[PDB]
Design a protein around this ligand. Structure first.
Ligand SMILES: Nc1ncnc2c1ncn2[C@@H]1O[C@H](COP(=O)(O)OP(=O)(O)O)[C@@H](O)[C@H]1O
Ligand SMILES: [Mg+2]
Lengths: 524, 524, 75
C-alpha cells in the first residue's frame, strides 16, 4: 500500500484542524448548561445529545491526517476517563488549548523541544498545586458525601456506597446488580475480581457499558493456551444443552479458536466469553487454583495429563454472575463449598509463615485477600423498571467518583481547580524564553474548561474567570446557579484523580504533537 | 506487462526524491531526543513513534521509480542492521548524505565512475581509522560493561550476558525466554542453532520480532525435497490431534506443499513452520543426523526406503522451544537421551582422527561444537508482565550490541566516531579532481549523523560539530545531557561493527545509484 | 532602507538591508509571542540610539593616505 507522507508544518497543520473539529464538536457540551449536538443515525430519527463522550465517539474525518489529529486526542482523552472515571471532554478541551497555542508558537519559529519542556513543567507544578488544593475524603461521612453529590443529591446512594466500603474496605470489590423489589439491598458474598479483560470486544452484550454480563454461567479453568477449537467440542456442547453461558480462563485463546468463539456468539448458538488467567508463570498456577476453589471447579492442567477433550460439566466452575470489561474480570457468588474456601485460606495463611521475602509475603497476602475478602453487591431497588435501570446507572456513576475521591481527594469542580492552580504558578519560569512561552501556553490552557462552561451558559468568560481568579482555595463560580462561593460546599466537585488525569493526558498528546515531524498514512 | 523506462538524469532525479522522502521521514528520530512520526493504522487510533525502523517499514511511494529509490535505501540499511544489530537509521541518514551530494555532482557534469571511486576510497580509509579509534571489548568486565550500557544503565543485564558468554563462550548460542518468577535465571541445556531461515514470512507468529516462536513442538527430519502435501497427511494429522506445533527440516519444501502449509497456518487448523536442512550434499547427511540425535528423532532417508507416509510421532524429534527468523533456526532443549548425545560426540570426536584435510578436521569440529556445546538460555525475571516483556526486550537489545562489541570493539556513539574519522583523513586525494569531489562528498556525509542528532535536539549542528572536531579520540557531545567529554566514559558507544556496517552499506547503495543509467518499472 | 542608506553615504546598502530583514524577522517572532509591538519598537529604538553613541566612541579618525586607500579598497 503506497503511502502519503507529510512533513513538519503540513503534518502539524493537518493535525491541528483534525483536533479542532474534535474539540469544537465535543466542547460545546461541557457545562451543566451545555448545548446540543445532533448525531445522525442511519435508520430513524437523529440523536440529540449533550454528552461529549457520545459526540467524540462519532468524530472521524475524511482527510486522513486531519483524522489522525482527531483520533489521537480521542485516544488519550479516553484513557483519562479509563483511569479516572471522567474528564474525557475536559481532557479534549485542554488538549485543544495546548495544541492550538503551542502549535502556533512552533510555527512562529520557536523551539518545539523547549515548548514541550515548559508545558511539561507547568503541568508537573500544577499537579502538585492540585494535591495541595485537594480536600481529603476518608471517613464514612465524607464517602457518603461525595457519593450523594455524585449521584445527584440522592442521599440513599451516598449511604449505600459508604456502607459497602464500610463492609469490604475502601479497596474491596463492590458491584451493582438489578434490584428484585422496591428495596435496596447490600450483601457480601464469596467472589473475586482480577485485572484481566475480554479477548474480544464482540463479547460485549451490554453495549452501553462496554461490558460483558453473564447470567450464572459455568466457568472453564484451563491451564494451557487454547488455540484449537477441537479441545472445546465436548465442553462447549454440554454447556449448550445446559442452556447456560460459559466463561473461559486460561493462559490465552489464539485466533483459531478465538475468532470462532467470537462469530459463535455475535449472532450464533452458544453465547460465551473468554479472558486470560491472572498472573504469569509460577504465580498463575496457584492463582488459578484459587478461582477453582472459589467456584468449586477443577483446573485442567496439561502438567497432569488431563485435556479439555477429557472434561465434563463436573469440572467447570460456577458463579451466580460475572462481569468483564476492557481490562477487568469480576466473578460474583461462587458455588464453591465454604469448607473448601475456608480450607484454602488456611493453606495460604500458613504459607505466609515462610516470610522469605516482603514480596512473597505481600503476594500471598493479596491472594488471601481476594479469596476470603469477598465481593460486596448492591442491588438497586426502584418502583418502575425505567427508574430502576436509571438509578442503577447513577449508583455506578457515584461508586466511580467515590473510589476516585478516596484515592486522591476532591477539588473545585467547575473548571475552578484548574483556574486556581494556574493563577498560583504565574511566576513560573524556565531557561529558554521558549520554555516560558511553553509554561504560559500551558497555564493559559488551564483556563479553558471554566471559560468554556461559562460560554456554554451564555455568560461572559473573561468576567467569570477574572473573579474566580480573584479568590482563593475552592472559591468559584457555579454555572448552574450563577453564584460564586466555595465550590465544594456548593456541591460542585471533581475527584482529584480526574482533574489531574485530564490535565496530564491532555498535556501528553499536546507535547507529542508539538514534537511531531512526520505523518504516514494511506493514499486517498 | 508494458514498462515505463527512464534514463540517466530522469532516472536519477526520481531516485533522489524517493530516497529523500525515506530519509526525511526516518532521520528526524535519530538522537536520544528524536521527534515523533505519526504512523496511521487502518482501524483505531494512529501510532506515535520515535523509532526509525518502524517509520522506514511504512515508507512506500506512489511514483514508482521514486519508490524504487526509497526501497533501495531501505533494503541496504536493513542489511546493515541484519549484520550489525543496529544502524538502520544511521545507514539511511548517511545514504542520503552521499546520494544527495554525489548526485548533484553527476548532474553538474562530473564523472560518475570517478565519484564512486572517491567515495569508495574515503570509506575504505575511514573504516581503517575506525579500527584504530576502536576500543576492544574482550574480558568479562568489558562484556558486562557494554551490556549494561546497551541495556540502559541496568547493571544486572550486563551481568547476565557476561555470565552466559562465560558459560558457552563468546561464540556459543545464547537465547532469551520469558521468566517464570521475579528472578532471573541462566541455564545451559542441550540444543543447537544453524544458519537457515523460514521458507515463508507467513510463518511468523511474533510480528514485532519478525520471528517464529514454537512451543515444545515435534520435529520432522526428512531427507528429500518435500513437494507434495500427500506424504504429510499421516504425520500432519497426528501432530494435529496432539495439539502441538511441528517443525520441518528437509532438503526444501516446494510451493505445492509450501503454499498449502502457509495458508494452513495463517488462520487455519495446524500451526506449523518449515526450514531447509543445514549444509549441502555429503555434509547434510550427518549434519541432519546430528539434530536427530539431539531431539531423539528419526531421520526419514529416501536412500533407505522409508517414506513420510510411513512415519508416526515416534519418528518426530522434540525440543522445548525453537525460534526461526529471516535466516536462523535455533532449537532449545532437545529431549534426545544423554547416553545418545554423548555417544554421537564420541563418534564424531573419533572421526576427527582422520585429519586428511584442515577443512575436514575443522568441519567435523564445528559439528562437535554445535552438538556438545549446547545453548545458554536467559529467563528474564520481573515484577509485572509489562516490566517483564520490556526488560526481556532490552536483554535482547544488549545481547545484540555485546555480540557485536566482542567482534570489532566499541567506539564513540553520538555520531562522534564518524565525525572523528572524517576530520582525520581530510587531506585524502584521488587522481581525478572528480575523485576528490568523491572523497569530499563522502567525508562530509560522515558528519550527517552527529549534525542530525544535534538538530533533533534543537541545538546548533555546525557549533556542536566544530567543537567535537576540535578534540581527539572519543571526545564528543552527549546530546542527552549536552556535555562534551569522552563518549565512552559517558556511556555513549556504538559497537565498531555497527558504525562500519552502516557506513559501508550507505556507501554501497550511494555508488550504485551514482552509477545507475536506466530504470525499468510497470506502467502507472 | 536600502535606498536611504545610499542617498546618505552611497555605501552599506546591502548591510542595511541585511540588518532590516533581521530586525523584522526577530521582531515579528516576538509579536507572535504576544508582545506589544509598540514597545518592541521603543526597545529597538533605545537599543539603536545607544549603539550609535557606541559607534561614535569606537570611531578613530581616518586621516593618513594609507587608511583612505584602505576604505577605498574595501569598498
Ligand atoms: N576581507 C574581508 N573580510 C571580512 N569582511 C570584509 C572583507 N572585505 C570587506 N569586508 C566587509 O564586508 C562588507 C561588505 O561591503 P559590501 O558587500 O559592499 O556591502 P555593502 O553594500 O553593505 O557595503 C563591508 O562592510 C566590509 O566590512
Ligand atoms: Mg559596500
Amino acid at each position: 500500500a503506497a503511502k502519503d507522507v507529510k512533513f513538519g508544518n503540513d503534518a502539524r497543520v493537518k493535525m491541528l484542524r483534525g483536533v479542532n473539529v474534535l474539540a469544537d464538536a465535543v466542547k460545546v457540551t461541557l457545562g451543566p448548561k451545555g448545548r446540543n449536538v445532533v448525531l445522525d443515525k442511519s435508520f430513524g430519527a437523529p440523536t440529540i445529545t449533550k454528552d461529549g463522550v457520545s459526540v467524540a465517539r462519532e468524530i472521524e474525518l475524511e482527510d486522513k491526517f486531519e483524522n489522525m489529529g482527531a483520533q489521537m486526542v480521542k485516544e488519550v482523552a479516553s484513557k483519562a476517563n479509563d483511569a479516572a472515571g471522567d474528564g474525557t471532554t475536559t481532557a479534549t478541551v485542554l488538549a485543544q488549548a495546548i495544541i492550538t497555542e503551542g502549535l502556533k508558537a512552533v510555527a512562529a519559529g520557536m523551539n518545539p523541544m523547549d515548548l514541550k519542556r515548559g508545558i511539561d513543567k507547568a503541568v508537573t507544578a500544577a499537579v502538585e498545586e492540585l494535591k495541595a488544593l485537594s480536600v481529603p475524603c476518608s471517613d464514612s461521612k465524607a464517602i457518603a458525601q461525595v457519593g450523594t453529590i455524585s449521584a445527584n443529591s440522592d442521599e440513599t446512594v451516598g449511604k449505600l456506597i459508604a456502607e459497602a466500603m464500610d463492609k469490604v474496605g475502601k479497596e474491596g470489590v463492590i458491584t451493582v446488580e438489578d434490584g428484585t423489589g422496591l428495596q435496596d439491598e447490600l450483601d457480601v458474598v464469596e467472589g473475586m475480581q482480577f485485572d484481566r479483560g475480554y479477548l474480544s470486544p464482540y463479547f460485549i452484550n451490554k453495549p452501553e457499558t462496554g461490558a460483558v454480563e453473564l447470567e450464572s454461567p459455568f466457568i472453564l479453568l484451563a491451564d494451557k493456551k487454547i488455540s484449537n477449537i477441537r479441545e472445546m467440542l465436548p465442553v462447549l456442547e454440554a454447556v449448550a444443552k445446559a442452556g447456560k453461558p460459559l466463561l473461559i480462563i486460561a493462559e490465552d485463546v489464539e485466533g483459531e479458536a478465538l475468532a470462532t468463539l467470537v462469530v459463535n456468539t455475535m449472532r450464533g448458538i452458544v453465547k460465551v466469553a473468554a479472558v486470560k488467567a491472572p498472573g504469569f508463570g509460577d504465580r498463575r498456577k496457584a492463582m488459578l487454583q484459587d478461582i477453582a476453589t472459589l467456584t468449586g471447579g477443577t483446573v485442567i492442567s496439561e502438567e497432569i495429563g488431563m485435556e479439555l477433550e477429557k472434561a465434563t460439566l463436573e469440572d467447570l466452575g460456577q458463579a451466580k454472575r460475572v462481569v468483564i470489561n476492557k481490562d477487568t474480570t469480576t466473578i460474583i457468588d461462587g458455588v464453591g463449598e465454604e469448607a473448601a474456601i475456608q480450607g484454602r485460606v488456611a493453606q495460604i495463611r500458613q504459607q505466609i509463615e515462610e516470610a522469605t521475602s516482603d514480596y512473597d509475603r505481600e503476594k500471598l497476602q493479596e491472594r488471601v485477600a481476594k479469596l476470603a475478602g469477598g465481593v460486596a453487591v448492591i442491588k438497586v431497588g426502584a418502583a418502575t423498571e425505567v427508574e430502576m435501570k436509571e438509578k442503577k446507572a447513577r449508583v455506578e456513576d457515584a461508586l466511580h467518583a467515590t473510589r476516585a475521591a478516596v484515592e486522591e481527594g476532591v477539588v473545585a469542580g467547575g473548571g475552578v481547580a484548574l483556574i486556581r492552580v494556574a493563577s498560583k504558578l504565574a511566576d513560573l519560569r524556565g531557561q529558554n524564553e521558549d520554555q516560558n512561552v511553553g509554561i504560559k501556553v500551558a497555564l493559559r490552557a488551564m483556563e479553558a474548561p471554566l471559560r468554556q462552561i461559562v460560554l456554554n451558559c451564555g455568560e461572559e468568560p473573561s468576567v467569570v474567570a477574572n473573579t474566580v481568579k480573584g479568590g482563593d482555595g475552592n472559591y468559584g463560580y457555579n454555572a448552574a446557579t450563577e453564584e460564586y462561593g466555595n465550590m465544594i460546599d456548593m456541591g460542585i466537585l471533581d475527584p482529584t484523580k480526574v482533574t489531574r488525569s485530564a490535565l496530564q493526558y491532555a498535556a501528553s498528546v499536546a507535547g507529542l504533537m508539538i514534537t511531531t515531524e512526520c505523518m504516514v498514512t494511506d493514499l486517498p
